[PDB]
Chains A and B, each alone.
Chain A
Amino acid sequence: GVQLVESGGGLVQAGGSLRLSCAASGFPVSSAWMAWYRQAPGKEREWVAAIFSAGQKTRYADSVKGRFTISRDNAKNTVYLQMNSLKPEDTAVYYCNVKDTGHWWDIYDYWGQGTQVTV
């Protein structure tokens, strides 16, 4: 009974900035490994960033090491990933991936519907 809800609302950036939010219900989003991915149109699957635990460890992708700066609300709320300067390769959909929770019986990988992000 866990759900992930996104809201990014991005159409055009042209070197601007935008923010994405990933709502979460089942897990406290405090000790739950969770991240974001990318699905370019006609291309394979890549990732963007991740939050490990307690809002301390946060590893980014190769192309966005300093471009993006994601953060976690630290409570049972949504996490935030924001857009930045013009990345033409960023014209893709962005999923919200959760792979670990506080439960030790949770084996499934829950995804998000995804937001169409274009510049």
Chain B
Amino acid sequence: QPIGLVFTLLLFGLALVACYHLLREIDPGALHDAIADVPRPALLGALSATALGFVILLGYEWSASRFAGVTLPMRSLATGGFSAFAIGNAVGLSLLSGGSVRYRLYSRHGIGAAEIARMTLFASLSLGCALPVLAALAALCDLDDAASALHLPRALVAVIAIAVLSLAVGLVAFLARHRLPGERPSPDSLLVRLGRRSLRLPGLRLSLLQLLITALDVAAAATVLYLLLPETPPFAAFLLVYLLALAAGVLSHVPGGVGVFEAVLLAAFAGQLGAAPLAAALLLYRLIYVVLPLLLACLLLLFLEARRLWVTRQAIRVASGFAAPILAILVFLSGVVLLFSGATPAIDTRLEHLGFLIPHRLIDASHLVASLIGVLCLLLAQGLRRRLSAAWALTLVLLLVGALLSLLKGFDWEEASLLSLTAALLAMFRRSFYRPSRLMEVPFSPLYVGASICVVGASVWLLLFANQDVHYSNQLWWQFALDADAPRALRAALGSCLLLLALALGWLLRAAPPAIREPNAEELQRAARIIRHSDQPDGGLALTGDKALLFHESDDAFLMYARRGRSMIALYDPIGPAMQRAELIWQFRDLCDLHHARPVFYQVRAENLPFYMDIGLTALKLGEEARVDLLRFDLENKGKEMKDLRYTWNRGQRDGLALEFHEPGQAPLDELKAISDAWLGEKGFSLGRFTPAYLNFFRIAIVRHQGKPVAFANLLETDSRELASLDLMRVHPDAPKLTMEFLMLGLILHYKAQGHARFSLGMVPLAGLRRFKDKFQPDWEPRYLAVPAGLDPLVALADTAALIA
């Protein structure tokens, strides 16, 4: 990650340096004239081309879903496609990614995560493989101009295009795919192929349809760029250049490819075209096709939450919504907009009208503080996505003050408005942010600081380009005048850089958090009290004193976890009320980030998946939990399986296998450890160990065979008396097979008599077992294992298996 961040920053800086060289021979007035020279029919055609491209994207998704096999309604599929493609195109995995938004939509719609990951991989690979073939097709079409545009001889371009096409049609199509076609497809359109692992690649018809859709999409994009530009080359060379630029921009991982795409366009069509018309076309195309779609998708997502999850009185903890991660995007956009407006000189007439009413030193101070507030909002955008109440309040106040300072600065209807709208939108979604955590303790990945550095560099580039009329001198910094705008921009840029550097240093020199430690007796007693006050007997595994605890700081909650390698594997869902469960999950996620460790969960209940999703964990079913319902369990009603169970009960009662219950810490121990030794003739994090205090914590039930203790099992209970679960099981080998079933049914009967509504038989792994568990005809619920960002589950499962012993 640090290497990738450094490489991306270096590439962005090189791209900006190259861009400034290419637009060296243009003044801002020429660019403004070129922008104003674009006719209204050109703008209308640009909007129409963007709409057509978005219909084509809807197609992208429809084909991807048909490839995966997931069946979705047309409206839901269209909404998901538009949202994912608008969010992913504007920003690349910086705040929100296409995978994350499509997960948050489809998983809510009730679709497994593996299919969604398949869809995302298929769309990405389809675009990445369609780009080279279309580029080669355009080259084959018009190499006469392609040689001139790219500045290489036509022979080399022709031979490389032909070689690329031949390699694709041979290996990509037949030699490496039809030599090993495969036996059968799982969905309608697939061809699973041999290799190290089976691969899901579409059939010939689906591949042809996807290629046609991608060709139409890139044609629409090149078309909007083409028609927004007055003087144009032939469409084939322009399309080739556009495809190469898109590949270069998306290959650099820069969000939106802003640095390199413009650089390639300006380096390929500089001499043959007009620098001012080309720059105006590039800026207008980016604004129309990237910023406006992002704004529209953000508004649509917030409308969906404001209607489908606010009009109905859900009365639930508002998490996993799109409020936080999209409001963070809006706040980042507001921050970058303020930073950019700081560099550009104000409108002459507006500046004069303002300065004839407000003191000019106030204008300078407002400019500087507005730039600082822009940097602050840009940095606070990270806090909003983590759902911090303090971040919400601070960002709202800063946005309001920034709007006021933009009005006080050179009169700006635009910024002021945009900001007021963002502030109102943030205010309307207060309930999404709930954590009372402190901003100064917020972990910061290098990605966000890199984005901040990139935006600051962009602002300084805009400062250098826009204020090139005024010559540079050391007296500019000391200059203070109303008409002077270059000194203003210089001071604002210097202050923003100083503030950002100070904040980055302060957050980089922070002391490391304390390492994990084994809990002491007081924390064990606290955990026991919390478990007793809760209704999750599965949490009693914390009392073994083998897992670190993360107590919630309000009144009552905890979360067991253990660190293996670079992964902080956790136990079941945090114990406590639902209102504190999400907060504890967020705290655990923050803790893992500070330690640079990947968060991993284990055996997660189906109800809490929204929180695991919104902190950035991918669901993965791994087993089933049997749950015998004690509500009815009638002794008279019988069937094929129930008759043999009561026969077992009768045989055990006749044999003399009477079962006895004991209070906690009051059972014989030497016989119990003898039974355990016989059973094993250690392990943890799933069952526990044989410790006198650990077994003392819970009640112990022992079954006696002709008076001797032969088997026992640990009992988990709660004060709520809602659910009961079994901790660990041990039977002496000399006992008959009748013993285990009799113990099971005796515990079930006692728990039913005591009044407990439900009983738990444990969790059975997914994919020769489960035959014994299903004998008691229980209700079965899924159990999920969460992994971060859809990483490799093999490493996580191997680590859990290694830690289990």
Binding site for B on A (CB under 8 A): 33, 35, 47, 50, 52-53, 57, 59, 99-100, 103-109
On whether the beta carbons of A53 and B355 are closer than 8 Å, the reply is: no
B356 at the interface (CB under 8 A from A): yes
Known: A53-B481, A99-B359, A106-B359. 6 other contacts (CB 8 A): A33-B482, A47-B356, A52-B482, A99-B482, A100-B360, A108-B359
User: Bound state CA distance, A50 and B355, in angstroms?
Assistant: 11
Q: Quote the shortest CB–CB distance from B494 to chain A (angstroms).
A: 15
Task: For B365, list chain A residues within 8 Å (CB).
Answer: 107
Of all chain A residues, the one with the shortest Cβ separation from B480 is A104
On whether the beta carbons of B360 and A99 are closer than 8 Å, the reply is: yes
Interface centre among A50, A57, A59, A100 (most CB of B within 10 A): A100
On whether the beta carbons of B356 and A33 are closer than 8 Å, the reply is: no
Q: Quote the shortest CB–CB distance from B716 to chain A (angstroms).
A: 69
Interface string of B344-373 (1 = CB under 8 A from A): 000000001001101111101100000000
Task: For B356, list chain A residues within 8 Å (CB).
Answer: 35, 47, 50
Task: For A35, list chain B residues within 8 Å (CB).
Answer: 356
B483 at the interface (CB under 8 A from A): yes
Task: For A99, list chain B residues within 8 Å (CB).
Answer: 355, 358-360, 482
User: Bound state CA distance, A106 and B360, in angstroms?
Assistant: 9
On whether the beta carbons of B481 and A105 are closer than 8 Å, the reply is: no
On whether the beta carbons of A107 and B481 are closer than 8 Å, the reply is: no
On whether the beta carbons of A107 and B361 are closer than 8 Å, the reply is: yes
User: Bound state CA distance, A47 and B352, in angstroms?
Assistant: 13
26 contacts between A and B (CB under 8 A): A33-B360, A33-B481, A33-B482, A47-B356, A50-B356, A52-B482, A52-B483, A53-B481, A57-B483, A59-B352, A99-B355, A99-B358, A99-B360, A100-B359, A100-B361, A100-B480, A100-B481, A100-B482, A103-B361, A104-B364, A104-B480, A106-B359, A107-B361, A107-B362, A108-B359, A109-B359
Of all chain B residues, the one with the shortest Cβ separation from A100 is B360
User: Bound state CA distance, A104 and B362, in angstroms?
Assistant: 10
Interface string of B469-510 (1 = CB under 8 A from A): 000000000101111000000000000000000000000000
The 10 closest A-B pairs by CB, nearest first: A100-B360, A109-B359, A99-B359, A107-B361, A104-B480, A107-B362, A99-B360, A106-B361, A107-B359, A33-B482
User: Bound state CA distance, A106 and B361, in angstroms?
Assistant: 7
Task: For B483, list chain A residues within 8 Å (CB).
Answer: 52, 57
Task: For A104, list chain B residues within 8 Å (CB).
Answer: 361, 364, 478, 480
User: Bound state CA distance, A95 and B361, in angstroms?
Assistant: 20
User: Bound state CA distance, A57 and B352, in angstroms?
Assistant: 13
User: Bound state CA distance, A59 and B355, in angstroms?
Assistant: 13
On whether the beta carbons of A105 and B361 are closer than 8 Å, the reply is: yes
Of all chain A residues, the one with the shortest Cβ separation from B483 is A52
Task: For B362, list chain A residues within 8 Å (CB).
Answer: 107
User: Bound state CA distance, A100 and B352, in angstroms?
Assistant: 14
Q: How many residues from B make CB contacts under 8 Å with A?
A: 15
Task: For A106, list chain B residues within 8 Å (CB).
Answer: 359, 361
Task: For A107, list chain B residues within 8 Å (CB).
Answer: 359, 361-362, 365
Task: For A52, list chain B residues within 8 Å (CB).
Answer: 482-483
Task: For A57, list chain B residues within 8 Å (CB).
Answer: 483
Of all chain A residues, the one with the shortest Cβ separation from B356 is A47
User: Bound state CA distance, A47 and B612, in angstroms?
Assistant: 64
Q: Quote the shortest CB–CB distance from B173 to chain A (angstroms).
A: 70
Of all chain A residues, the one with the shortest Cβ separation from B352 is A59
User: Bound state CA distance, A52 and B364, in angstroms?
Assistant: 17
User: Bound state CA distance, A103 and B359, in angstroms?
Assistant: 12
Task: For B358, list chain A residues within 8 Å (CB).
Answer: 99
Task: For A108, list chain B residues within 8 Å (CB).
Answer: 359
User: Bound state CA distance, A48 and B482, in angstroms?
Assistant: 18
Task: For A105, list chain B residues within 8 Å (CB).
Answer: 361
Of all chain B residues, the one with the shortest Cβ separation from A59 is B352
Interface centre among B359, B362, B481 (most CB of A within 10 A): B359
Of all chain A residues, the one with the shortest Cβ separation from B478 is A104
User: Bound state CA distance, A59 and B365, in angstroms?
Assistant: 25
User: Bound state CA distance, A45 and B359, in angstroms?
Assistant: 16
User: Bound state CA distance, A2 and B247, in angstroms?
Assistant: 64
Task: For A100, list chain B residues within 8 Å (CB).
Answer: 359-361, 480-482
Q: Quote the shortest CB–CB distance from A62 to chain B (angstroms).
A: 12
Of all chain B residues, the one with the shortest Cβ separation from A53 is B481
Of all chain B residues, the one with the shortest Cβ separation from A47 is B356
Task: For B352, list chain A residues within 8 Å (CB).
Answer: 59
Q: Quote the shortest CB–CB distance from A56 to chain B (angstroms).
A: 11
User: Bound state CA distance, A47 and B478, in angstroms?
Assistant: 29
User: Bound state CA distance, A47 and B353, in angstroms?
Assistant: 11
Q: Quote the shortest CB–CB distance from A106 to chain B (angstroms).
A: 6
Q: Quote the shortest CB–CB distance from A110 to chain B (angstroms).
A: 9
User: Bound state CA distance, A53 and B360, in angstroms?
Assistant: 13
Q: Quote the shortest CB–CB distance from A64 to chain B (angstroms).
A: 15
Task: For B482, list chain A residues within 8 Å (CB).
Answer: 33, 52, 99-100
Q: Quote the shortest CB–CB distance from A61 to chain B (angstroms).
A: 10
Task: For B355, list chain A residues within 8 Å (CB).
Answer: 99
User: Bound state CA distance, A50 and B364, in angstroms?
Assistant: 20
Interface centre among B361, B362, B365, B483 (most CB of A within 10 A): B361
User: Bound state CA distance, A109 and B356, in angstroms?
Assistant: 11
Q: Quote the shortest CB–CB distance from B369 to chain A (angstroms).
A: 12
User: Bound state CA distance, A59 and B349, in angstroms?
Assistant: 12
Task: For A53, list chain B residues within 8 Å (CB).
Answer: 481
Q: Quote the shortest CB–CB distance from B410 to chain A (angstroms).
A: 15
User: Bound state CA distance, A10 and B352, in angstroms?
Assistant: 30
Task: For A33, list chain B residues within 8 Å (CB).
Answer: 360, 481-482
User: Bound state CA distance, A95 and B183, in angstroms?
Assistant: 94
Task: For B478, list chain A residues within 8 Å (CB).
Answer: 104
Q: Quote the shortest CB–CB distance from B93 to chain A (angstroms).
A: 44
Q: Quote the shortest CB–CB distance from A60 to chain B (angstroms).
A: 12
User: Bound state CA distance, A72 and B481, in angstroms?
Assistant: 18
User: Bound state CA distance, A102 and B355, in angstroms?
Assistant: 16
Q: Quote the shortest CB–CB distance from B409 to chain A (angstroms).
A: 14
User: Bound state CA distance, A23 and B358, in angstroms?
Assistant: 22
Interface centre among A47, A53, A59, A99 (most CB of B within 10 A): A99
User: Bound state CA distance, A106 and B483, in angstroms?
Assistant: 17
Q: Quote the shortest CB–CB distance from B745 to chain A (angstroms).
A: 85
Task: For B480, list chain A residues within 8 Å (CB).
Answer: 100, 104
User: Bound state CA distance, A109 and B359, in angstroms?
Assistant: 6
Of all chain A residues, the one with the shortest Cβ separation from B360 is A100
Q: Quote the shortest CB–CB distance from B679 to chain A (angstroms).
A: 83
Task: For A47, list chain B residues within 8 Å (CB).
Answer: 356
Task: For A103, list chain B residues within 8 Å (CB).
Answer: 361
Interface string of B379-409 (1 = CB under 8 A from A): 0000000000000000000000000000000
Q: Quote the shortest CB–CB distance from B473 to chain A (angstroms).
A: 16
Q: Quote the shortest CB–CB distance from A23 to chain B (angstroms).
A: 21
Task: For B359, list chain A residues within 8 Å (CB).
Answer: 99-100, 106-109
Of all chain B residues, the one with the shortest Cβ separation from A104 is B480
User: Bound state CA distance, A108 and B359, in angstroms?
Assistant: 7
Interface centre among A53, A103, A105, A107 (most CB of B within 10 A): A107
User: Bound state CA distance, A99 and B361, in angstroms?
Assistant: 8
User: Bound state CA distance, A33 and B357, in angstroms?
Assistant: 13
Of all chain B residues, the one with the shortest Cβ separation from A99 is B359
User: Bound state CA distance, A109 and B362, in angstroms?
Assistant: 10
Task: For B481, list chain A residues within 8 Å (CB).
Answer: 33, 53, 100
User: Bound state CA distance, A105 and B480, in angstroms?
Assistant: 10
Of all chain B residues, the one with the shortest Cβ separation from A108 is B359
Q: Quote the shortest CB–CB distance from B665 to chain A (angstroms).
A: 75
